[PDB]
Amino acid sequence: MKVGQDKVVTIRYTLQVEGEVLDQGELSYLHGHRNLIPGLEEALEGREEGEAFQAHVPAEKAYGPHDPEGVQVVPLSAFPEDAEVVPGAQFYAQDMEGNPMPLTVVAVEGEEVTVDFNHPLAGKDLDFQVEVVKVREATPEELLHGHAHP
């Protein structure tokens, strides 16, 4: 069974940016519904179960470019009082539609805390070693929901 539309695909992957490997894992995802970065998805389309390969995905095709307008500053008022505001910590805020917008705090300067709304991998190209371990037809319920059930 080959990777294709409406098939739940389980793969294990190693990620390298520039030359540094930054993560390794196993994931299953539903193919064809925008659940996986496009460049990866395009590499996987058609692969037969068992195939193993290397894939290079430019930033535009994975997480996009870094947007300068995505880095902003808000008072420490906004952060919770129990909370630790330290470089690296991650929080969410609320958009006008009401939906959460996540951020990673970049710097704290007294009253002013600067945060970054970009994806952490924005602007960085990615290198992958990938193993396709299983492709299965999707379940009706996965199809109504839009996601593989983990």
């Binding site: 992957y13 994931l27 995802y29 996986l36 496009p38 996540p102």
Partner: peptide, 14 residues
């Protein structure tokens, strides 16, 4: 803007 932000494998927000 960041329409890719939630896509796998490394997904920003959940």
């Amino acid at each position: 803007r960041y329409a890719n932000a939630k896509m796998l494998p490394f997904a920003f927000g959940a």
